[PDB]
Paper text:
Here we focus on human T-plastin, a member of the plastin/fimbrin family of tandem calponin-homology domain (CHD) proteins. T-plastin is a 70.8 kDa monomeric protein that functions as a key actin network stabilizer, strengthening and promoting cell protrusions by localizing to lamellipodia and filopodia. While most cross-linkers bridge filaments through the dimerization or tetramerization of subunits featuring a single actin-binding domain (ABD), plastins contain two ABDs (ABD1 and ABD2) within a single polypeptide chain, each composed of two tandem CHDs. They also feature a flexibly tethered N-terminal regulatory domain (RD) consisting of two Ca2+-binding EF-hand motifs, which inhibits bundling activity in the presence of Ca2+ while still licensing binding to single actin filaments by unclear mechanisms.
To test this hypothesis, we utilized the –Ca2+ dataset, where bundling is not suppressed, which we initially analyzed using IHRSR. However, during 3D classification of the –Ca2+ dataset we noticed a weak signal distal from ABD2 in one class, suggestive of a partially ordered additional domain (yellow circles), which was not present in any of the +Ca2+ classes at the same stage of processing. We therefore employed symmetry expansion to analyze each T-plastin binding site independently and extensive focused classification to obtain a 6.9 Å reconstruction of what we term a prebundling state consisting of the entire CH2–3 linker and the final three helices (H2–H4) of CH2 within ABD1. Aligning the prebound and prebundling states revealed a major conformational change within CH2 and the CH2–3 linker upon actin engagement: the CH2-3 linker’s ∼120° swing results in a rotation and a 48.7 Å translation of CH2. We next examined whether this conformational transition could directly prime ABD1 for engaging a second actin filament by repositioning it as a rigid body with ABS1 available for binding. Instead, the CH1 position predicted by aligning ABD1 from the prebound state with the portion of CH2 resolved in the prebundling state produces a major steric clash with ABD2, a result that is incompatible with a priming model. Along with our observation that H1 of CH2 is not resolved, consistent with partial CH2 unfolding, this finding suggests that the prebundling reconstruction likely represents a frustrated, metastable state where a partially disordered ABD1 can sample a large conformational space to search for a second actin filament. We speculate that the formation of the metastable, single-filament–engaged prebundling state allows ABD1 to conduct a broad search for a second filament.
Residue numbers in the entry:
A (entry chain A): 291 to 310, 326 to 626
B (entry chain B), C (entry chain D), D (entry chain C): 5 to 374
The structure:
């Protein structure tokens, strides 16, 4: 019952330790601090306050279980689908990269492939959310759709979406037709989306910058200054640095922020091999994602050296700054 | 970063990035507007169709080419085309790349100036450059001396170069190219009762021309051959399932290239124009010109064209000269190819027109820098 | 609140709310008046009968259709019908509901204007609209391209649409429909000696037509089969208990759709009308139309109609085209279903004609809005 | 002896003798066949009707025009019409007269060849000739310089001539003529509830057109005038005694000559067609073409047409050239009059295709001698 192990939030700490203990803090406020630390190691914080434990807030107690379980459903990580780099075949790499971006951003329907994915407004509308554009949900409807209430009502939503975006305009999207989502023209398809992702990244730069787009120099400078707190590795030198083995140092920087549950027995010295690099590519991504990083890059950057993507990690790092 | 090569022909749009061996996007240079009554709600929202979508749905649209005889006649639609190519076909931000553009010779200068203004003010590109198309063709060939015969959809022009230098006084241009041949084919298709009148039918007949026409080596012999036997007849299936048959027009159309009076034109044939251009040059370089005759453009893709030109110019030569025709398979893109080459050069990077320069000298700067 | 979809068909009235999958009410478009002495006090006070009441009591009534060939010929009776519709069949207050109305193309304009005035003044509807019936048929199919063949009780018309656009010059209309088939069946039934001359007898013949007739795939060998054997004959029972028998009339009646000369009409068959409508279209969309042939209306409910059309249109097509006919089970309500669909759309809500606009433009407003 | 002049138009047949100032025989170019069951012995033996007797008995006949758009589509009926012309209307033996025929430009070659073969092998004429109708029209005007606009029942075409020389590359043809206007009028007659379906009713509508239609000098204000007042309304009496009234379609039908979009065609109007034909000619002769715009054919007989043409061309002209249109009252027979003039000239007598030349060269001789 609630008064047994829930009024004190006793079970939640064991749950948090299961998905990462905690109950040993012996005091409600110390336990809540432990909960915040566990959240720092898990990323599930959306609404947590000390009243959940100190005052035993039943609304908070009943609400936070969703954050605990939905984010960690038996650790069924969708990236372990991407570990099959071509889990589907025939799609171009660029499309795969955009798909990954949407996957990282938590769009509620799951990704399958770019041609089937985004055949509806709901997708692009979720995108519109991430760009903070307001949405008239009253004009937004349902997905299953019967013979009555068919693709035509879908079309209502679809062209609605094209009025959207062109509301603040500037995205040069005039050529896009409101009926073409059903049509699915390939270049039209890619056109309407790539700029979106670019815009988002621009937003990221502005967000982590000092009121403007962040510059390359301050990136590595802050990284190294943080690295100075953990300088077992020398530094990061350039975005064009071929010695991608330095990825281990990215993880060490992570360790600097939080040493929790990392595998440095998995970690190997600078004389790495390509298999180690493949291992690293996914492992680092996983760690970052679980910490809370909205990782936009594909793991291949650890073997392909793409300067344009690496900033993804440093973003969340600066956020922790 | 990387420069952009856009070859804005009269008939086809050719574009891509520097350093590549082929253009990434090739599509017709047309704009289509609906020509009938929209009746289903939501469907009629689209006023314009630009690239290959215009061709597919041509059945309900009126087709306009923004370029005729290589002069941009509709400037708003040209903007539509450039927007389309930048954002849709290549999907890049023009503010981040220098761009290379092409032009035919003997053109009105304001055409050049306006395209400059557009690039710098609508797209505000970092830098740009405009080049003559035949020059790029030569660049595509790896040679430094020769006369280039260029024939795309709207203009035919000849340019000679010796050791990297052109000779402008001998430059000759003929407003006679593929589109006119198409119109003439329309004209003569009625003789068998085949009628095509609309802009959409024009594409059908252009396809017809591109698939069934050829260059005879002897016009009178082939005319007699057709007059005697049907061995030259060939058949074509129209989009609705109708099949038509031609065997005489398959060559009467390209002959206009050597007989412009067919369409009432007074100008001389391509062989003769080439020859006269050669005769306007120094007697000392003509021999080298005779050995390097370079052709480019889709209208230069007819079967037998190289041999016919070989024979004709041999007939015009002092007979002690050697006549050599150069006709690579990639003729269709030699312009864009030479452009990619040129733009990829480290030395060219100082030849770009920068926005700063434009901001002071206005659009006129192009006449100085190009 | 919610909208109303009333398809005043030539012989049948189809109606209901927007959002439902079937017209809530369906009844004959008739008015009856007594023709005999009312011998009982109090029972004869009712001067007119409208819906199924008219049909059930037809034994003592003279029946009339206010609409013929899709033109409203009796407006007062039509008003009776609309009153019955809304108040007795729907039991709704029209002042609270916008209303969607239907019409065949190529109709006299005054028909449309008068129904407009009626709705806004007699009924004072908040808003309304008049749409072409075949368009609704296409809405019902979920397509945006195809040709619709619609055949009700008064008119048979052809409408081609490509991508939500129609071609008015290619629209075909034929004043030959089910009522005509019924009258011709009445005529031919005299050769066996059966006679039907009164208005109620016509209803009986209509039941027979809807019960025993069919379209022959090839009429000639069918006539031969009926001439030799008797397997085609079938029997029907009259209300008094008499039985009649027919074998040959079962298919000679629907054949007039393909041979209008049976009733002396010079016009060509429905297949031929379809094909010619196709040929009036731009060559570039004919293939898709050939693939999208939509049937609609109670008359097209004959068994074998689609196969016969398939055969015939194949016989006319260039044989490379893939002929396809679409014949859903709910053909009898395709128009009304499409209307419900359309009324259900938020984007359509601004397309209504409000009474306010009418108060400015009079009934002529319909020609601009619809 | 003397030459026969036969102008075979799409709608009307003009025939006579050279040197006469008017055709001796003018009758419709039709063939009629019965479409009903004959019931009186000895009356149904006649299988076909050709001349004005077909027109008078059209109520029981189906009417076919052998020529459509200046193309002979049925040759057996064409032979019937030629037999009627020679033996019934003119009552002469063709074996004793050289014969001059007419044809439209941009026609298929088989048409001219087959008429040559028919004349030599069926009617066994001694000599023949095929002339261009517009050229004959210039002869009738007593001129050697000007651009001719010929408009009959099937074809509209333009031919510029300067000092006796044609400019074939500037000849333009439009398949829009009086028959199409008749069909359009039929379409728009239904707005008021008038219906015409039968080929005989088509002739009825053609009569209505020839009587009540005129050309508006400004279409947009004539529409407003008709919208606000009934002053333009006019009445017509049907053969059965019914009376119809039209007041808006009178100018809507002929406006199609300037707005072919009304019938769904992409092409431009007659005024722009003529202007383009002129702009295709040499800049030196354009003033003379502007001052000599010759009209011909029955379709050019509408009231107000010459004024509208002068106004539209003036709008298209550089405002310095004066614009003059020549429209003689004998416009309906200008082609035939010019034919009689040409056949009467002594310098023309060496230009007949003699039957000996035909016997040694086949039907293709007409291409070389005409
Ligand atoms: N195989 C072919 N045979 C004959 N003509 C062709 C062929 N391919 C293309 N053409 C014609 O050549 C033109 C090709 O356009 P292009 O050479 O790109 O001209 P532009 O440089 O003006 O765009 C088209 O007008 C087309 O009609
Ligand atoms: N099963 C059937 N077989 C043949 N004819 C039918 C059938 N059902 C209905 N009809 C005919 O269809 C007509 C009614 O069709 P409908 O589309 O409702 O016409 P309207 O729109 O004019 O009311 C009637 O004349 C009837 O004869
Ligand atoms: N006064 C008139 N007003 C309008 N149209 C006319 C007039 N007279 C004749 N027509 C039309 O002109 C056509 C016949 O013209 P004509 O030049 O004789 O044709 P064709 O060249 O085929 O003989 C018919 O379609 C007829 O309707
Ligand atoms: Mg080009
Ligand atoms: Mg119906
Ligand atoms: Mg004529």
């Amino acid at each position: 019952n609630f008064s047994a192990d829930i009024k004190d939030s006793k079970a939640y700490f064991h749950l948090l330790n299961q998905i990462a203990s905690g109950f040993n803090e012996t005091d409600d406020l110390k336990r809540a601090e432990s909960m915040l630390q566990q959240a720092d190691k898990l990323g599930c914080r959306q609404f947590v306050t000390p009243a959940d434990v100190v005052s035993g807030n039943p609304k908070l107690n009943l609400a936070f279980v969703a954050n605990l379980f939905n984010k960690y459903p038996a650790l069924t990580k969708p990236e372990n689908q991407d570990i099959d780099w071509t889990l589907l075949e025939g799609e171009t790499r660029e499309e795969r990269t955009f798909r990954n971006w949407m996957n990282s951003l938590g769009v509620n329907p799951h990704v399958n492939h770019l041609y089937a994915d985004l055949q509806d407004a709901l997708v692009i509308l979720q995108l519109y959310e991430r760009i903070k554009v307001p949405v008239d949900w009253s004009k937004v409807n349902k997905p299953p759709y019967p013979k009555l209430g068919a693709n035509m009502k879908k079309l209502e939503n679809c062209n609605y979406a094209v009025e959207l975006g062109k509301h603040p305009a500037k995205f040069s999207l005039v050529g896009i037709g409101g009926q073409d989502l059903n049509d699915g023209n390939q270049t039209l398809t890619l056109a309407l989306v790539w700029q979106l992702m670019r815009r988002y990244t621009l937003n990221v730069l502005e967000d982590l910058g000092d009121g403007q787009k962040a510059n390359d120099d301050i990136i590595v400078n802050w990284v190294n200054r943080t690295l100075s707190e953990a300088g077992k590795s020398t530094s990061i030198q350039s975005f064009k640095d071929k010695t991608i083995s330095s990825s281990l140092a990215v993880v060490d920087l992570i360790d600097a922020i939080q040493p929790g549950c990392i595998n440095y027995d998995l970690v190997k010295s600078g004389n790495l091999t390509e298999d180690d690099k493949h291992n690293n590519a996914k492992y680092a991504v996983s760690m970052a994602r679980r910490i809370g990083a909205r990782v936009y890059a594909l793991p291949e950057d650890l073997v392909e050296v793409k300067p344009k993507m690496v900033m993804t990690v440093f973003a969340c790092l600066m956020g922790r700054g | 970063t990387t420069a952009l090569v856009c070859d804005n022909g009269s008939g086809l749009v050719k574009a891509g990035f520097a350093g590549d061996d082929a253009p990434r996007a090739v599509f017709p240079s047309i704009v289509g507007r609906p020509r009938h009554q929209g009746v289903m709600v939501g469907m009629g929202q689209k006023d314009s169709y630009v690239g290959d979508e215009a061709q597919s749905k041509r059945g309900i649209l009126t087709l306009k080419y923004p370029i005729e005889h290589g002069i941009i006649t509709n400037w708003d639609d040209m903007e539509k085309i450039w927007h389309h190519t930048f954002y849709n076909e290549l999907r890049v931000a023009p503010e981040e790349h220098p761009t290379l553009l092409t032009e035919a010779p003997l053109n009105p200068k304001a055409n050049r100036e306006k395209m400059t203004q557009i690039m710098f003010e609508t797209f505000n590109v970092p830098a740009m450059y405009v080049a003559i198309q035949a020059v790029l063709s030569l660049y595509a060939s790896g040679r430094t001396t020769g006369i280039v015969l260029d024939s795309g959809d709207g203009v035919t022009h000849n340019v000679p170069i010796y050791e990297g230098y052109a000779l402008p006084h001998a430059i000759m241009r003929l407003d006679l190219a593929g589109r006119d041949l198409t119109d003439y084919l329309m004209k003569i298709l009625t003789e068998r009762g085949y009628s095509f009148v609309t802009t959409a039918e024009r594409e059908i007949v252009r396809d017809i021309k591109e698939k069934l026409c050829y260059v005879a080596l002897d016009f009178e012999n082939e005319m007699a051959t057709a007059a005697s036997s049907s061995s030259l007849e060939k058949s074509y299936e129209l989009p609705d399932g109708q099949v038509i048959t031609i065997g005489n027009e398959r060559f009467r159309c390209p002959e206009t290239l050597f007989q412009p009076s067919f369409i009432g034109m007074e100008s001389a044939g391509i062989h003769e124009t080439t020859y006269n251009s050669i005769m306007k040059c120094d007697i000392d370089i003509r021999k080298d010109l005779y050995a390097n005759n370079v052709m480019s453009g889709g209208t230069t893709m007819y079967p037998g064209i190289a041999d016919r030109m070989q024979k004709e110019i041999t007939a015009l030569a002092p007979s002690t000269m050697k006549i050599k025709i150069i006709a690579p398979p990639e003729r269709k893109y030699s312009v864009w190819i030479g452009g990619s080459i040129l733009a990829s050069l480290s030395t060219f990077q100082q030849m770009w027109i920068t926005k700063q320069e434009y901001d002071e000298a206005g659009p006129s700067i192009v006449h100085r820098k190009c």
